[PDB]
Design an enzyme around this catalytic site. Structure first.
Site, PDB file in Angstrom:
ATOM      1  N   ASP A 160      -3.752 -14.101  -0.859  1.00 20.84           N
ATOM      2  CA  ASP A 160      -3.357 -14.270   0.544  1.00 20.84           C
ATOM      3  C   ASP A 160      -4.594 -14.259   1.441  1.00 20.84           C
ATOM      4  O   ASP A 160      -4.722 -15.049   2.378  1.00 20.84           O
ATOM      5  CB  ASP A 160      -2.419 -13.150   1.013  1.00 20.84           C
TER       6      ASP A 160
ATOM      7  N   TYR B 294       0.829  -1.201   0.000  1.00 21.79           N
ATOM      8  CA  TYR B 294       0.000   0.000   0.000  1.00 21.79           C
ATOM      9  C   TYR B 294       0.873   1.265   0.000  1.00 21.79           C
ATOM     10  O   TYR B 294       0.557   2.257  -0.675  1.00 21.79           O
ATOM     11  CB  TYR B 294      -0.947  -0.016   1.203  1.00 21.79           C
TER      12      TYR B 294
END
Lengths: 349, 349
Positions: free
Chosen positions: A237, A122
């Site tokens: 994930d 991010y």
């Protein structure tokens, strides 16, 4: 009475998942529940680094976006950064001191580590598309809408951590602290955990998937494609993560792991339903915030709220809760091509 | 008063390493100390899986070993498994709740995760060379010699964790708990951390290196070569780990990070010296245990104890402690070819 190496030679196969003897020797030749060993192994196999994705062209795309489309994208990104800032630290801080089997202990550390990679990804995205990243990161803390979600989500963790510290320090019973009465109850602590695990399940199985739709909707428009490559990795994930908490919760409520936990899961079964519904609604209200200044091709408040209901029903059946919404079909089947892995089922089934 | 997401919008660049505002937003575009970002990035770059090393031939070698050489090797392996069982969980449990800058927070989770890989590698080795791994793993808990080390090493963590829980729950001051008086002091907690970090530094910078010599001595004899390939990977990580705690400790005692911590480091400067010396001696006594039934080509009690002194002097100067041993040269320069990486300085300089 937490010990980083308990001196008792216990049979780790017979320990409960939680609240048993703290794990001494970390060994991986045997498990009580091999799901957690399979999750470790899969998550290890997925290891990626954010920098291996070129997000260069996202800067051009983002700057070319209309203001309300910037708002959609950056609000979404901000929200994701919030969620996995929490998910980076919290499974370690909240769950590690309570785990009593080695395979679950290491899954939780592996889980949390994989989140720090998401958070690092991010940053990689943010610092590549905006001029002043500090404006973005600061808004994550001070944004009214983001803050509401942060507070509710973090309270489930916080309350579990604080009740854990009392338990370790004081043990079970009624206590006297500075002239006040503190009652420590294992049963309540077991409940606090269950609710937290239900909350964390909603977070990863529902809240992040609402965010995945938003990201992939840009990619469908052939915009913000670097971001979408990362979200694809992040989604793969996440499918592991929610699978982990689905097993924890299902193993807890069956009573196979802890007969007590079975009765406790039934006692707050209503409360869990309410928790999930409140999360579903909150994400619907989030859709309102995202599209307040307009929507874009292929994604709007109505379509996104439909998706919220669709995914919320699926996740809840997975953990044995009643469905709160009309049995609906997938409003955005185009998301499934993004939500895919040949090694793990990413898309909800 | 631990929060998994503190609502205050703080300037993370101005926070202390420890005991400040819990980290809210996990961001990696800036640091107070970029060493920790460089450690994350390096450790990420080193990611390995134990199964990528074939240890097949170690089973043949091990079975062919004389009984006392089996004892040397398996005692060493057992000890390593103990140490990183502790190092797998403890940095997360003990340090995470105290960290107040994001780069240090994520380094610690990355650090601990890399340890679970070491522990998983120890299983991989054990299950390939012995018939009944349970005998081995059980002895780790019940072995008299191993147990002594486990207890001392784990106490530094445990005491820090328990004092942390009081601090979060009660805050600073003199308290009343069930008719007893509990005095919570930030100054003492800061000391408890410093000592723990000194202990963890000795553990990784000294104790594991004593173990690396033992492993590589077999590899010098062209025995247990699969094991040695893994220890080479493990040693490269370890050089990162001890580098991390050397900076923490040095940043703490300089007073640059926290003027208080400077005076506290001087106050227990003697105590830290004593801690390291006691660890050095304990590893010397461990050498006694390893070679009680005989030694092997190229490594014995005398040579190993020499190495202990040589490495102990180096590590202590690194953290500003007086040297406790005669200034000596490297008794086993052959270890340096094993202790090497082109990306990080593994061998002590």
């Amino acid at each position: 009475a937490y010990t980083t190496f308990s001196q008792t030679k216990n049979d780790q196969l017979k320990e409960p998942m939680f609240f048993g003897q703290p794990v001494n020797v970390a060994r991986y030749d045997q498990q009580k529940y091999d799901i957690f060993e399979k999750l470790i192994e899969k998550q290890l196999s997925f290891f990626w680094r954010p920098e291996e994705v070129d997000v260069s062209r996202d800067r051009i795309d983002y700057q070319a976006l209309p203001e309300h489309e910037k708002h959609i994208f950056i609000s979404n990104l901000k929200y994701q950064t919030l969620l996995d800032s929490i998910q980076g630290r919290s499974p370690n801080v909240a769950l590690l001191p309570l785990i009593s089997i080695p395979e679950l202990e290491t899954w939780v550390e592996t889980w949390a580590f994989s989140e720090t990679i998401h958070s690092r990804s991010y940053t990689h995205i943010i610092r590549n598309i905006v001029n002043d990243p500090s404006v973005v990161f600061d808004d994550i803390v001070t944004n009214e809408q983001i803050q509401k979600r942060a507070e509710g989500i973090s309270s489930y963790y916080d309350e579990l951590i604080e009740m854990t510290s009392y338990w370790h320090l004081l043990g079970e019973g009624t206590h006297t602290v500075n002239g006040k009465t503190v009652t420590v109850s294992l049963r309540e602590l077991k409940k606090k955990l269950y609710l937290c695990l239900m909350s964390v399940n909603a977070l990863e199985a529902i809240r992040f998937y609402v965010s995945f739709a938003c990201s992939f909707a840009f990619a469908e428009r052939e915009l913000m494609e670097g971001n979408a490559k990362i979200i694809r990795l992040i989604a793969r994930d996440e499918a592991l993560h929610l699978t982990g908490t689905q097993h924890m919760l299902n193993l807890l409520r069956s009573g196979a792991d802890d007969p007590e936990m079975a009765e406790i899961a039934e006692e707050c079964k209503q409360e869990c339903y309410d928790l999930f519904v409140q999360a579903a609604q909150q994400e619907k209200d989030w859709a309102d915030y995202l599209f307040r200044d307009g929507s874009m091709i292929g994604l709007n408040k109505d379509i996104l709220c439909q998706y919220v209901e669709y995914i919320t029903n699926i996740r809840m059946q997975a953990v044995g809760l009643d469905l709160p919404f009309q049995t609906r079909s997938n409003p955005i089947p185009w998301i499934n091509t993004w939500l895919v892995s040949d090694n793990v089922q990413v898309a909800p089934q």
